[PDB]
Amino acid sequence: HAQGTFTSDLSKQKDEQRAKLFIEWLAAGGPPSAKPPPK
Ligand SMILES: *C(=O)CC[C@H](NC(=O)CC[C@H](NC(=O)CCCCCCCCCCCCCCC)C(=O)O)C(=O)O
């Protein structure tokens, strides 16, 4: 289905950044590093 390709691609692109962050952000040192959470 189209799934509103534009908004779904935003949602995918957020998921990707939020996720690569999540695991890297974790590796950096989650909230202690003073780097934002995925959101
Ligand atoms: C970004 O700018 C695009 C829009 C943005 N997308 C996201 O935030 C990421 C996708 C989003 N993820 C979540 O919402 C995660 C939490 C899901 C909780 C679901 C609870 C039930 C919801 C019921 C909705 C009923 C709707 C009725 C009318 C059609 C996602 O998966 O949507 C964004 O703002 O979503």
Side-chain angles (χ1 to χ4, degrees):
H1 180 53
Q3 302 180 262
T5 304
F6 173 64
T7 193
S8 181
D9 292 14
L10 291 170
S11 306
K12 285 170 169 288
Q13 287 177 103
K14 301 197 198 77
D15 186 290
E16 291 183 308
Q17 184 183 355
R18 285 172 180 173
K20 182 172 64 172
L21 282 176
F22 178 74
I23 198 71
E24 292 179 356
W25 175 69
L26 284 187
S33 309
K35 294 176 177 172
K39 296 173 171 173

